[PDB]
Design a protein around this ligand. Sequence first.
Ligand code: HEM
Ligand code: HEM
Ligand SMILES: [C]C1=C([C])[C]=C2C(=[C]1)N([C][C]([O])[C]([O])[C]([O])[C]OP([O])([O])=O)C1=NC(=O)[N]C(=O)C1=N2[S](=O)([O-])[O-]
Ligand SMILES: [C]C1=C([C])[C]=C2C(=[C]1)N([C][C]([O])[C]([O])[C]([O])[C]OP([O])([O])=O)C1=NC(=O)[N]C(=O)C1=N2[S](=O)([O-])[O-]
Ligand SMILES: [C]C1=C([C])[C]=C2C(=[C]1)N([C][C]([O])[C]([O])[C]([O])[C]OP([O])([O])=O)C1=NC(=O)[N]C(=O)C1=N2[S](=O)([O-])[O-]
Ligand SMILES: [C]C1=C([C])[C]=C2C(=[C]1)N([C][C]([O])[C]([O])[C]([O])[C]OP([O])([O])=O)C1=NC(=O)[N]C(=O)C1=N2[S](=O)([O-])[O-]
Lengths: 386, 481, 386, 481
Amino acid sequence: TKEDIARKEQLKSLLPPLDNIINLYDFEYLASQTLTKQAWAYYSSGANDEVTHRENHNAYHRIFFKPKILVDVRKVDISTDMLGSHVDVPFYVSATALCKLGNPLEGEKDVARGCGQGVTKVPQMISTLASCSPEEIIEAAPSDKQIQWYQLYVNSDRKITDDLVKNVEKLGVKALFVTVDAPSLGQREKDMKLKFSSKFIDPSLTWKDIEELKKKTKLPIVIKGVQRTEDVIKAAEIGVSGVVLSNHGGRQLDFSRAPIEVLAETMPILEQRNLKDKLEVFVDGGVRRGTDVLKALCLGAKGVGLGRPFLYANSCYGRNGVEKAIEILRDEIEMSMRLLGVTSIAELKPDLLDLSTLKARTVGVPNDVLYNEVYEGPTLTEFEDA
Amino acid sequence: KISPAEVAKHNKPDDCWVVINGYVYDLTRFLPNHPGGQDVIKFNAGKDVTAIFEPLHAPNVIDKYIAPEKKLGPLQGSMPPELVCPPYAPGETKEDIARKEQLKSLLPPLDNIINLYDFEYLASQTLTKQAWAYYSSGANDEVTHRENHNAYHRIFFKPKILVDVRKVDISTDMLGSHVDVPFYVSATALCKLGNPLEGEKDVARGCGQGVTKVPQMISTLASCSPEEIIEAAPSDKQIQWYQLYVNSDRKITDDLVKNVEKLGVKALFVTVDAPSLGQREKDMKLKFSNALSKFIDPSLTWKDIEELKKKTKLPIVIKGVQRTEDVIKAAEIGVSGVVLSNHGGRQLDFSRAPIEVLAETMPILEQRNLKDKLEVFVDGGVRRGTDVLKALCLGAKGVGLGRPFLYANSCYGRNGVEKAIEILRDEIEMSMRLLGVTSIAELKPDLLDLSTLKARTVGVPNDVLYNEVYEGPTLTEFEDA
Amino acid sequence: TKEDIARKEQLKSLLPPLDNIINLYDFEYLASQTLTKQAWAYYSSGANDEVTHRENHNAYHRIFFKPKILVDVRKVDISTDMLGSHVDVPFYVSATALCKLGNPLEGEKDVARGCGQGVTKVPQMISTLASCSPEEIIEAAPSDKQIQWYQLYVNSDRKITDDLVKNVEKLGVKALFVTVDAPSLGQREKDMKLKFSSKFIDPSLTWKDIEELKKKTKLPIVIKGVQRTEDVIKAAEIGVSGVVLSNHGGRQLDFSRAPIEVLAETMPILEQRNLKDKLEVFVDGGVRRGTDVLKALCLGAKGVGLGRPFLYANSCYGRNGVEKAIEILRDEIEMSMRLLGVTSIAELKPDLLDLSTLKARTVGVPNDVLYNEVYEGPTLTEFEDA
Amino acid sequence: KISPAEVAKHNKPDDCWVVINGYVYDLTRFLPNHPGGQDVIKFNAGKDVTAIFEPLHAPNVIDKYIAPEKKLGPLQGSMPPELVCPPYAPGETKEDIARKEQLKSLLPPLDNIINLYDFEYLASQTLTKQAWAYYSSGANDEVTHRENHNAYHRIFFKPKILVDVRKVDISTDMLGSHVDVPFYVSATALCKLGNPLEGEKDVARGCGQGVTKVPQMISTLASCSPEEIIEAAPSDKQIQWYQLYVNSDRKITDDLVKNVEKLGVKALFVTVDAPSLGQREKDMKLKFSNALSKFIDPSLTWKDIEELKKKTKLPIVIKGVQRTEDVIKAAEIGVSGVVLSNHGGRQLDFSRAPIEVLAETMPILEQRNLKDKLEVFVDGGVRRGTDVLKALCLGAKGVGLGRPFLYANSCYGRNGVEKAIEILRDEIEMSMRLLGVTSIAELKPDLLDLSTLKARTVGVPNDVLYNEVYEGPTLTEFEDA
Ligand code: HEM
Ligand code: HEM
Ligand SMILES: [C]C1=C([C])[C]=C2C(=[C]1)N([C][C]([O])[C]([O])[C]([O])[C]OP([O])([O])=O)C1=NC(=O)[N]C(=O)C1=N2[S](=O)([O-])[O-]
Ligand SMILES: [C]C1=C([C])[C]=C2C(=[C]1)N([C][C]([O])[C]([O])[C]([O])[C]OP([O])([O])=O)C1=NC(=O)[N]C(=O)C1=N2[S](=O)([O-])[O-]
Ligand SMILES: [C]C1=C([C])[C]=C2C(=[C]1)N([C][C]([O])[C]([O])[C]([O])[C]OP([O])([O])=O)C1=NC(=O)[N]C(=O)C1=N2[S](=O)([O-])[O-]
Ligand SMILES: [C]C1=C([C])[C]=C2C(=[C]1)N([C][C]([O])[C]([O])[C]([O])[C]OP([O])([O])=O)C1=NC(=O)[N]C(=O)C1=N2[S](=O)([O-])[O-]
């Protein structure tokens, strides 16, 4: 109801200067105060109780580092290559449907500008349901070396997909991410709630359709949305290039595991089934700090993705916001490796980690209301009255 | 003919004379065995209690429980005016109207309810204090009632991708019939507290009127008679199940089984987990400023259930089993099923959550080959479609809900019970696709991550001095705000 | 400061009628509002951070029951015998120094009246630093069969102790509890704090002094204050009768284990070293409900003790308070056995218990301030405005 | 002679000219290597900065760090009035006086402080915002800083009874000397933020004036010179230890070791866990509206420590080891000790708590026989006497505290540092009796319950809808109140 004015006093001239944004949560606190209710509902939502959405972040907290001291770390190099090309930093913007709800004027173009306008050029997955055409987004994209991938929601009308694959290969996208964790649109009750005052995606998809989609294209194929060791090993038996261990930001099945627990489980199997070199394994979901990024790289992930932080940077400070988020994260990784005693993404191995309490995901017995309610704790000292 | 004078006189505990609907009853022998505590009858002895009485009981109870020669006689004209008891609402102020504006249509239109918690919220705001305490309470500290639900959250899923999940089919077979859904309505006592006009006649209706029909379990302590509730059923194809408390006068029980069998209920669920009434302190508290009885016999034994099979042709399900050895025993006397339950945490506190006993029991049932010969149901704390799926993956034939159907029926009558069925039917169908399975038959434990099932912790007390002085990081302030 | 008047409007005629006290916590909420600050400080205190004081209660919550259904439980008998005599119920009032701070007019006499004035007669441990003489307390004691024990703080001046042992044996006390967990008076900073506006106990005590104290008396001897399996087995090698597994209500060493964890550990060793029949093992600390009592009895304890609940019942409703607390607890035990499917304290064995998470005493990693601070949960439905 | 005009001119990042105490300095080469960030120097370039400068630095720093020919010359008379910088208190309003009434004597009399948390509380109320942020902050999310202390609580005790604990003796030997206590004061940088007049000269004093004297570790970044701090020591028998950051200009480091060795410090603690400055976001935040440098060389290697042994006769302790393999390496190059530390959680977040690495390390040190040849110290989050005892039982020779001595010295100067020593000396003595041991030598791991050491959990998110609607039990209301 006419909040738009209050909200406008918020973003107009009260957002702080980008030089004061310390971490990816600041982009998120500011976007929750100014985005429109339906932008906010749609970007932040999770499926149902959002325990997977949050467990995704929190599972990073079950893993602690075992650093090395007295290692020369004057120079640290954080570039890696993902899926053939060499990339500046080991993370990427992952794909967000409808980026124009938050940044109406420039949509997923400003993200494209942000991933290539600064020193660091980060990859950008363009969403099949992006609110700006592939055409435009790739054209906004400031800088040759900055790479871009299409993620695909195969349609029931396979005609539309085949044309679309062909048209983006024409446009030079550098790989195909087929999202398979969404045969139906998980329930996101925050949306639902405010929406009170699908043909588009084919629920029939199958590994055979991935096999045929292989033959219809030359780009590399990454299945986005694996959540089991068994389908990582399958995506390897039908020969795709990649697999993103992901549960769609916890917007699809609640009580799906966090990707980092599934990565730590799958990688030893890959190594024992000898498949490890044959598969790029990416991981996204709830990654908010450089040490999160680094924990996933140490276990074997090739690149970790981020959806919501970029998206809220982009919605509050447009393409410049996305540049600042790209470097905030770039400095976190870089400072932490220096502190970890490694100098290059390939040095990042598992023995930099204490994985002994990775499975200490607990649900504690219900608090004792009454005992807690009569108990009074000690008190600090006081200060003279006056 | 009995004079008011003579009547009123006997207002004392070892001589309870009371009047209900212009009739005097000698309730002396009766009150220590009144299911809803003897306090009510004791206190209101020597009065005309009909307003307490008439709106909370099944129409058949005076005839069914009191010896014929205790129905004393007609009261002459009427009581003294301050001897007719007004409707029982302990602790309720004149609130009755503020909670009636609260419910009168400020209750949101029934197509805006997104989940089963919405009905809890709505009922906690509009229901009568006696009925909220009665419906929402657990035994003592309620740690088993909360634990019943949180134990679900110690289980994660292990989904399949790129499976054609175009058509998914959630229907199944429970106890001989084929049901549309894998959940049912468990027996709750006294539904008229929250739905004074229809009570159970409305859950008979929401369960059967729609394109999905859910099994209904009727309670031995239901505020409507089993005839009234079956007669309310709108569909000829919906299943009703009768739940039994066996009385110390076993002929009373024996007539009751014969009766519900003729009305055509389809199974007999014999509750065995309340030999004594658990202590529900929110209720208790509500009378102080507002445990045995012969009614539930505290002597049932495995031999009784052995004798009941012989008296009946309905399948018998033992409802209230809390450990594997009793699951295995129930199997050995050839009963058809067992409902793993702790009665919604209203009886022993620190009884375990049924999802955890089921994860324990079903592998022992498989290894003993008794697995295919006993259907195992589970209830307690099931609020979402993925709780139901966690139980079906571990082996339970069917999942019971007692409390969400009581708040739904309480705020919205039968269309609440039908809406509540759609919420949950959609949530299950919806996560069967995202799990990559298309039929209940495909739910297997290899779809669950069971490795932290047992990670039920009690953490050490924390340090109020360390945390009293710690300040966390802060977010950026706006230039304004 | 003149709170005494407000406080007096509290206890005078605003305490609820004893018939409305539902559980042992109600006695505690009411005593915290009316006791004098120094009574309250001294009764509720723990050593230092009070984590042992609370862990004592909470460790009961790590243990869940495995009940039996379809057991005739029309009749349940909860009496047991402790230390030779046969006792009504399996719990006892444990010893509280200075009971007159809360009940100034009748001190530990009203407790003595309370343990024998009703149907149930419960034991009463009389404290060496009780604020009423043994003489009086035993004389207040209404009823022959009601039993009473002295607990002893041996003095440095052993003369005073020897006379005192002899004088209480004269007075018919039924056993000696020597408290050994207190060679110094643990720091109870709530006291300390309000006290801003020892020869009495011998820190030299040793198992030899217990050996000699055996020869100077005929009463049975219980060492109160064992906290290790090793000294349970020692108290058995020098032949005393009992041992109370206790850490003095967590007023002595913080980070002492809860008695119930130590009981569950010690009892199998006793059984394997064959000593089990030779030792009564009691257990007190943080027992507040009948199911607590029952969990300790199932593992082998002979009787569980309670300090603070009796003490606050006694300070708010004097001897009648203590009667009501004795029956509140008596009905809890009795209802729960009925629900457990057992009919007699000897039926209470370990297999009535799920001890699988007894050691799930966890300290979780620090909450993530910022993530939690930007996250907003789902919302219940609302109700029309008006 | 230099004219104000010429000076002020160069107020730009690649030409920093600044005036401090009537003297112009060319600080251009210098500011990217200024330990307290280059931002301060950058911003105040072209001004007379003496009020920022004079009150926060050791008296010897311009002479020790700047090339002699950069000390430009005398400034002629004085700056423009709005070019003399006022004392740095970022984000502090005129608050300086409300916090000065706060501290002026409404600070409670020093014999009422019951524990080390009291000083935290008092300093958080009276200290300057720059100094509270600086002293109290951790890296990033601060989970290692809090975790440093809570890890203690995952260890319980296993006490002895009926042991004669009449006389208990807490004294011990650390690094060759015999100390009265098993704790010491770890090096904190900039003590003048919280104690502007004496800084470190007062912890030299509280540590030595009393009947108990505690070892003091002096920082390479101390706001007083190592001479001033040793000269302040009141007792001839107290131990001072020097902590080193080695600089990229190794001659600067080499002169510094030679110097502190002549002043008679007793050990060299070489911090190795901050090659780069951890990101302490409370500080950061305080300048926005208020990481390498050559100063700490990011190239030290095990060979450097190998070369330092040859240059020195002090024992060398490596301070900042976070894993067993580096404990074992430090042992293999024959250094005397290792301080298991993560620098008070100010450097890498998700580094482990030192009490847990020590429980891991000491059994591997015993089995390799290196156990007796390396003294292992531990710091981080030690606030009570039973934390110290948990570390001594597991093997640590001595426990370090950096932050409680900084709040104590900040609110109460040297008598705070002496009081803080008594609080902790009493708490240790006191629990050695209740453990039943009378000497540090008797503390062994068979006195600890170590079975839940590793029970460091992160629980699943909980269900805000289930808990939003649950109401717990309530206590009895008074008839009144
Ligand atoms: C005439 C014989 C009676 C029979 C056979 C009878 C039977 C029952 C039964 C089967 C219940 C269900 C218990 C539950 O689950 O809560 C009940 C509850 C109750 N009855 Fe009766 N009743 C009788 C007389 C009375 C009388 C005379 C009163 C009037 C004071 C009364 C008041 C109640 C109340 C208040 C409850 C609900 C328990 C509560 O307070 O939550 N009943 N009765
Ligand atoms: C003349 C050469 C200088 C030397 C050798 C020097 C040295 C140092 C050292 C060793 C520290 C300790 C760092 C810490 O742990 O926080 C420090 C801090 C600091 N210095 Fe200097 N400094 C110099 C010039 C300046 C100047 C000209 C300013 C004036 C703006 C200044 C302001 C500060 C401040 C503000 C800090 C504290 C860091 C904070 O803000 O928390 N320094 N300096
Ligand atoms: C957030 C989001 C949105 C807004 C949208 C979207 C998304 C999300 N997604 C997801 C992804 O990309 C990822 O995975 C992320 O997010 C991760 O996590 P974080 O935590 O970081 O956030 C998606 N996906 C796909 O594939 N596609 C698209 O488009 C998307 N979107 S939806 O579908 O959901 O709408
Ligand atoms: C809640 C409830 C009520 C109200 C009542 C009742 C009950 C309950 N129950 C129980 C059952 O049904 C179940 O189990 C349920 O509840 C579970 O939980 P949830 O959580 O889901 O809810 C019962 N039972 C029988 O059988 N009967 C009857 O009636 C009942 N009720 S009482 O007895 O308690 O009254
Ligand atoms: C509480 C208390 C008080 C007040 C006092 C006292 C006590 C206590 N104690 C202790 C005992 O008795 C026990 O152990 C109890 O308490 C248990 O716990 P609960 O939780 O229940 O509370 C004691 N002890 C002895 O022995 N003695 C005496 O006297 C005592 N007291 S003091 O010493 O501590 O004062
Ligand atoms: C807190 C602190 C400050 C203020 C400063 C500083 C520090 C700290 N550090 C560290 C040490 O000393 C230790 O480790 C402690 O702190 C532990 O924790 P607590 O929790 O106990 O407190 C340091 N270190 C060295 O070495 N140096 C120096 O100077 C220092 N400081 S900084 O660097 O960071 O500035």
